[PDB]
Design an enzyme around this catalytic site. Structure first.
Site, short mmCIF file in Angstrom:
data_model
loop_
_atom_site.label_atom_id
_atom_site.label_comp_id
_atom_site.label_asym_id
_atom_site.label_seq_id
_atom_site.Cartn_x
_atom_site.Cartn_y
_atom_site.Cartn_z
N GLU A 109 1.00 -0.39 -2.98
CA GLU A 109 0.22 -1.62 -2.87
C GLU A 109 0.01 -2.26 -4.23
OE1 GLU A 109 -3.72 -1.11 -3.65
OE2 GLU A 109 -4.45 -2.07 -1.82
N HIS A 110 -0.27 -1.44 -5.24
CA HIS A 110 -0.51 -1.97 -6.58
C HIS A 110 0.72 -2.67 -7.13
CE1 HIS A 110 -4.24 -1.06 -8.99
NE2 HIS A 110 -4.59 -0.59 -7.80
N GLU A 158 -9.04 2.34 -12.53
CA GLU A 158 -9.74 1.87 -11.34
C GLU A 158 -10.43 3.01 -10.61
OE1 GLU A 158 -7.47 -0.54 -8.69
OE2 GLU A 158 -7.34 -2.24 -10.06
#
Ligand code: HEM
Ligand code: HEM
Ligand code: HEM
Lengths: 29, 54, 418, 47, 51, 446, 99, 55, 55
Positions: F60-61, F137
């Site tokens: 996804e990143h 993150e």
């Protein structure tokens, strides 16, 4: 990005709105 | 104070034997005691409240 | 159906669009806010926003809360510096009850002393919650520094006034600022005649313009907080055009040219000129965007930056230099076109949702009276020329600037240095 | 951060009904609770 | 009293009535057993083996 | 003078069509000039094993970080130039990439979505950069207390099951992940039968279907060497995980019981029950007069800063409960009141509060499905979970069937005498021991 | 007629003799406590001083001078509106609870 | 509202005494002999009372 | 330092109960009958115990 400093509410939801204030990718960086 | 006098009367009746004069006095005293505690005092209190414009 | 606009004799504006949707949203937009507060009654707008559930002449606090909850409705108060919006949302069948509650709240508040005293702590609770994000305090200080008058007033009550707001002040503010000429009743999913009937029923009283606030005056000051946060939030702005003006559209296009908000999640803001311009200089975690605020009297335009405390000066200087480069004429037609597309898409996406559409209709009704179709707004965006964007950049660079900074601020430049 | 710790396996302690990790616990919950409450009931009867 | 004379209170009453009846049954059995009340136990099968 | 029933009948209907490869193309058409087109993939942490956990988050990143057809900057430039907003969200059960864009820009948006889903570069340098970003993150996400307490709830409730794994994954996996693992994850989980192309707004279903046939057709549902991932039911374990950190200002506690799956009919009565319980935050204006007894008591005694009730549903299991933030010395009281409300709904629910809960649920359903983005999200998620987008009229009928008897039945089945799963964070010393919490789940009176 | 007997009861009750007013002598239940906390500060301070002076007088078994006794007409029911509002709000809450 | 166990005075004392009393988790069976002594005292009182009815 | 009357637990209970208990100033002689009942109870207990030594 105004980022209207909203407040969670039901039956009384005080929301106050400001103007575009960034804070866009701080989490990303 | 009527109730207090009634309790004094009940004491006196209990001391005295169960004969004609005291039997009726005792029955009346018991009825009056229960009546004063149950019916008369609340109704009189309500009347007082009405008198004080409540 | 189509949106129907009616200006009543008392001055109230009634709008309705029958979307034939399961939910109906009714909003009363009133031209009151922090701007119309004087020094004595600062923060009264905040408590008024909080005091939407207090006992009214028509209904008690218990009845309002319980009824709105029972129908599953929501009562929301949205406040800007120039506007306050009371909205009720529920199923179309039960809209009448919430409409009665809304007009009871807006037109016949009681402001009983005990309830206001109880609610005064919610002022501090709300202020603390809002100030958790540094952006709120930075923008409050930015408005305070930029203007010496009405617009400088904070959207949140000042700390010294937390317990000092009086019911008389609330009544005075409502009577002098909640008036028919200042109000617009906007409805989605409600027929126009019904809204008109309710407006006559409750909003007949308190007619007239009401008390008028003074014109905002640019102050060109700086406020530096020194809160010790790791990242430094700094905003540098200059006076701009009022809302609904040609230069205002030019400034919006300029904001989109420089870079307003990332469109791709976790992206590099490639289109955003400020972002890349800063990024090449600074390799540390950073952020930058264009701050475009437009109000009826005047507006502010500038740059908002979030960066590491040590590198704040570099980021601010790089963004300022990029704006200077735009002002000097280094602006391509393609960039202008892309910004125009982004702005038009943003307007459409904003009016897409029911809340956004209601807010836009209310804002147009209060600011300009009539409702302008989205196509005409897009045409206004298209009409902006590149020369207008260059002139807006030149005005920002040349004009006197106001700055608000929060954080360590050890290396954050002062306005004179910039 | 908070994603580097997994609940330590209690299988040695777990009852046979819930040893499997591909079986819904609700199926055997009634049985296990019935057993424990039966023990309690018998104790109460004796007392 | 007039406060509790309401339909919702009637609903709550209906909700708790079977529970109240069960608690009454528990009380009855408890009493009969603790006192070994012969009047009731006489009918009870295989408890009638006593007395 | 349209009525609620008439309005539900007039709602535009979702049309579902399937490409031969297995991609399902769904659309709801409105007069709006803006459209939201997105691809919902039935891939998530629950489909990941221990070593490859968090690969979905990595993919996804870096999905928007470049394609073979257009390099990393090119995709972002196209999206921003047409004014579109590109966003992705990854959950334990679903992964989605959606583009908010003008209706006239639908073809280009579909092209970009197909390129992102199929022809993802997964370049190694970008892989290292995203590795650093993801570690940072994770460190940031440690700060968000709500996310941490919910992750703890999943870990303790579904221990020994794939659902326990976090979406982001352990940091060790993040640093050990390689290009081969990400490519294998894409090959295994991104398959045409497990994907849904959904759109909302000014989208013609025929045009969307034709664009899908043009671009997504190459994607195939065949599994290399017939290595087919198989869905696994996840066991719900009643357990308590307490991270006692007295330095933290406020204590977060999340308590839940096993809930129905997505398709189970009991979800609607349970949502009504949770709406009856309600939600409260200190910033709520209603305060004491609020109908929710827990909210009213919390406001009166200032028990908790915030409390909310959640109904998280997965394919075969779900977490049903509430999350409340409170002071160190008010945790026991709030837990007592929450369990009291649960038992009151289980045993002696009344018609009036049921009507309130049904109305709240109706309003939430109608309000949430507003705008192209939420409507498209609902379309995709409904196709993936329910296999069908349940129309609002069907939701209304199911809500209307709910009565006090139904609420009592379902609440007794799911909430009464059931072992709960508790996760606590912060100054949680006053949080009752698990034996007391379990004892609270039943009433000696009933 | 009725005002005659009411005035008789007012004199018969001694709260005028202690300088009190009728609303000072009301029993402090929850409704009365809420009404008291809703009083304006001037009324509240007057109330507390009246009651304190009355308690002091009763302590020494003395009565206020005849001229300083409260008058039946001059007696003002300060607490009546607030108490009525409290009772009405409680009635509404009970009514909503009923159904 | 308040829990009667924590708010009613007699119940408050009883709760703080033998319901919510914070007790160490590792006390052994040697820490039951105190409660055994209390039970013995109550038993002796009851038994002696019934004995004294005939003594 | 702290005042022993306030701090020590048993002395704290006795203090709040009898020493520094807030009491109304105007309670008359009729209120003394509670303490008189207490004195009567104590006197009866001692007297009856001393009777029971010879009964
Ligand atoms: C800690 C509590 C007590 C202890 C340790 C204790 C101890 C004893 C002992 C060792 C005996 C001798 C019994 C025998 O020789 O068979 C006895 C007898 C007796 N005690 Fe206690 N006692 C206690 C409490 C009481 C109380 C509370 C009562 C009355 C209220 C009571 C009344 C009697 C009587 C009536 C007897 C005569 C029983 C006999 O003759 O066997 N005792 N006690
Ligand atoms: C052995 C029996 C009793 C003892 C030792 C006792 C003791 C006391 C004491 C020391 C007080 C403090 C205030 C005062 O002394 O006036 C008191 C107050 C009170 N007692 Fe008892 N009492 C007894 C019996 C009773 C009975 C039989 C009743 C009611 C039927 C009662 C009800 C009350 C009440 C209502 C008060 C409140 C006094 C006030 O308002 O100041 N007591 N008692
Ligand atoms: C505390 C309240 C008490 C009351 C109201 C009370 C009352 C009485 C009364 C009315 C009698 C009969 C007196 C007579 O006619 O001769 C009596 C006798 C007696 N009481 Fe008590 N009593 C109390 C406490 C006690 C206690 C604590 C004991 C402990 C041993 C006790 C031991 C006796 C004895 C042994 C007798 C018989 C001796 C006698 O009658 O002179 N009493 N009591």
């Amino acid at each position: 990005g105004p980022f209207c400093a909203g407040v969670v509410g039901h039956a009384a939801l005080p929301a106050t709105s400001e103007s575009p204030v960034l804070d866009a990718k701080r989490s990303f960086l | 104070w009527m109730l207090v006098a009634d309790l004094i009367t009940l004491t006196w009746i209990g001391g005295q034997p169960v004969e004609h004069p005291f039997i009726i006095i005792g029955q009346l005293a018991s009825i009056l005691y229960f009546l004063i505690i149950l019916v008369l005092m609340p109704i009189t209190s309500i009347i007082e409240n009405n008198l004080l414009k409540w | 159906q189509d949106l129907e606009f009616t200006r009543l004799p008392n001055g109230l504006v009634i709008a309705s669009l029958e979307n034939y949707a399961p939910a109906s949203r009714i909003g009363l937009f009133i031209k009151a806010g922090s701007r119309y507060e004087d020094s004595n009654n600062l923060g009264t707008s905040h408590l008024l926003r909080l005091a939407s559930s207090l006992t009214t002449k028509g209904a008690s606090s218990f009845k309002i809360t319980r009824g709105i909850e029972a129908v599953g409705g929501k009562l929301s108060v949205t406040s800007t510096r120039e506007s306050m919006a009371y909205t009720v949302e529920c199923l179309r069948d039960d809209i009448e009850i919430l409409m009665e509650f809304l007009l009871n709240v807006t037109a016949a508040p009681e402001f009983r002393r005990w309830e206001v005293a109880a609610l005064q702590s919610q002022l501090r609770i709300d202020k603390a919650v809002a100030f958790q994000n540094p952006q709120a305090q930075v923008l409050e200080n930015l408005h305070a520094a930029a203007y010496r008058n009405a617009l400088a007033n904070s959207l949140y009550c000042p700390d010294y006034r937390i317990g000092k707001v009086t019911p008389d002040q609330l009544h005075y503010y409502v009577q002098n600022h909640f008036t028919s000429a200042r109000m617009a009743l906007i409805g989605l999913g409600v027929s126009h005649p019904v809204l008109k009937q309710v407006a006559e029923r409750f909003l007949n009283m308190r007619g007239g313009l009401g008390l008028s606030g003074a014109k905002a005056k640019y102050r060109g000051g700086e406020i530096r907080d020194q809160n010790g946060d790791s990242l430094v939030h700094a905003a540098l702005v200059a006076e701009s055009a009022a809302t609904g003006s040609a230069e205002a559209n030019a400034f919006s296009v300029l904001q989109h040219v420089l870079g307003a908000g990332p469109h791709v999640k976790r992206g590099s803001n490639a289109t955003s000129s400020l972002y890349q311009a800063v990024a090449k200089g600074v390799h540390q975690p950073f952020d930058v965007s264009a701050f475009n605020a437009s109000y009826s009297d005047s507006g502010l335009f500038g740059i908002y930056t979030i960066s590491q405390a040590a590198s704040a000066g570099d980021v601010i200087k790089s963004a300022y230099d990029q704006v200077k480069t735009i002002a000097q004429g280094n602006l391509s037609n393609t960039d202008v076109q892309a910004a125009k597309n982004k702005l038009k898409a943003g307007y459409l996406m904003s009016v897409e949702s029911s809340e956004g559409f209601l807010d836009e209709v209310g804002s147009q009704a209060l600011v300009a009276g009539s409702y302008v179709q989205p196509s005409t707004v897009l045409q206004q965006i298209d009409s902006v020329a590149d020369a207008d964007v260059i002139n807006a950049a030149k005005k920002f660079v040349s004009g006197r600037k106001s700055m608000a900074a929060s954080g360590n601020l050890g290396h954050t430049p002062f306005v004179d240095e910039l | 951060s908070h994603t580097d710790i997994r609940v330590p396996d209690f299988s040695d302690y777990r009852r046979a009904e819930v040893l499997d990790s591909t079986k819904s616990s609700k199926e055997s919950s009634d049985a296990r609770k019935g057993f424990s409450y039966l023990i309690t009931a018998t104790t109460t009867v004796g007392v | 009293l007039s406060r509790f004379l309401g339909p919702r209170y009637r609903e709550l009453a209906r909700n708790w009535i079977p529970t109240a009846s069960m608690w009454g049954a528990v009380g009855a059995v408890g009493l009969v057993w603790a006192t070994d009340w012969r009047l009731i136990l006489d009918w009870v099968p295989y408890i009638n083996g006593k007395f | 003078t349209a009525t609620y029933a008439q309005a539900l009948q007039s709602v535009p209907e979702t049309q579902v069509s399937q490409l031969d490869n297995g991609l399902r193309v769904a659309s709801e058409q409105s007069s709006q000039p803006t459209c939201t087109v997105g691809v919902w993939i039935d891939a998530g942490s629950r489909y990941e094993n221990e070593k490859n956990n968090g690969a979905g988050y990595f993919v996804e990143h870096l999905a928007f970080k470049g394609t073979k057809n257009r390099p990393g900057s090119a995709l972002e430039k196209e999206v921003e130039s047409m004014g579109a907003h590109l966003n992705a969200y990854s959950t334990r059960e679903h992964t989605a990439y959606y583009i908010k864009a003008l209706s006239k820009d639908l073809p280009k948006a579909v092209e970009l979505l197909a390129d992102i889903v199929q022809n993802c570069s997964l370049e190694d340098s970008q892989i290292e950069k995203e590795r650093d970003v993801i570690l940072q993150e994770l460190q940031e996400n440690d700060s968000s207390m709500r996310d941490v307490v919910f992750d703890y709830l999943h870990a303790t409730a579904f221990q020994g099951t794939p659902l326990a794994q976090s979406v982001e994954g352990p940091s060790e996996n993040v640093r050990k992940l390689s290009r081969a693992d990400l490519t294998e994850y894409v090959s295994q989980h991104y398959k045409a039968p497990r994907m849904v192309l959904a759109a909302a707004g000014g989208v013609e279903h025929r045009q969307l279907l034709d664009l899908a046939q043009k671009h997504f057709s190459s994607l195939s549902g065949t599994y290399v060497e017939d290595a087919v991932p198989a869905f696994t039911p996840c066991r719900f374990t009643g357990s308590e995980i307490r991270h006692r950190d007295d330095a933290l200002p406020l204590a977060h506690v999340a308590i839940a019981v096993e809930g129905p799956g997505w398709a189970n009919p009991d979800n609607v009565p349970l949502q009504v029950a949770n709406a009856i319980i309600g939600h409260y935050d200190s910033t709520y204006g209603g305060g004491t007069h609020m109908s929710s007894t827990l909210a009213s008591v919390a406001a009166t005694r200032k028990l908790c800063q915030s409390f909310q009730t959640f109904n998280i549903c997965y394919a075969e299991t779900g977490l049903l409960g509430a999350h409340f933030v409170c002071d160190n010395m008010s945790i026991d009281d709030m837990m007592f009141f929450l369990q009291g409300q649960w038992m009151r709904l289980c045993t002696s629910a009344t018609e009036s509060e049921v009507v309130r809960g049904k109305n709240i649920l109706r309003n939430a359903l109608v309000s949430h499905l507003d705008g192209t983005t939420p409507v498209c999200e609902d379309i995709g998620r409904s196709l993936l979970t329910y296999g069908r987008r349940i129309p609002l009229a069907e939701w209304e009928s199911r809500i209307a069937e709910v009565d006090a008897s139904v609420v009592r039945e379902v609440c007794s089945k799911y909430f009464y005498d059931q072992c709960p799963a508790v996760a606590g964070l912060g100054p949680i010393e006053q949080l009752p021991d698990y034996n007391r919490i379990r004892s609270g789940m039943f009433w000696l009176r009933f | 007629w009725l005002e005659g007997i009411r005035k008789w009861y007012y004199n018969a009750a001694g709260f005028n003799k202690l300088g009190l007013m009728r609303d000072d002598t009301i029993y402090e239940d929850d409704d009365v406590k809420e009404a008291i906390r809703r009083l304006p500060e001037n009324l509240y301070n007057d109330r507390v001083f009246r009651i304190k002076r009355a308690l002091d007088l009763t302590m020494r078994q003395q009565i206020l001078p005849k001229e300083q006794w409260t008058k039946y007409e001059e007696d003002k029911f300060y607490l009546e509106p607030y108490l009525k509002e409290v009772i009405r709000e409680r009635k509404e809450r009970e009514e909503w609870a009923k159904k | 509202m308040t829990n009667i166990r924590k708010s009613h005075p007699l119940m408050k004392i009883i709760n703080n005494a033998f319901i919510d009393l914070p007790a160490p988790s590792n006390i052994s069976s040697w820490w039951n002999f105190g409660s055994l002594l209390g039970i013995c005292l109550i038993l002796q009182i009851l038994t002696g009372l019934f004995l004294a009815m005939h003594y």
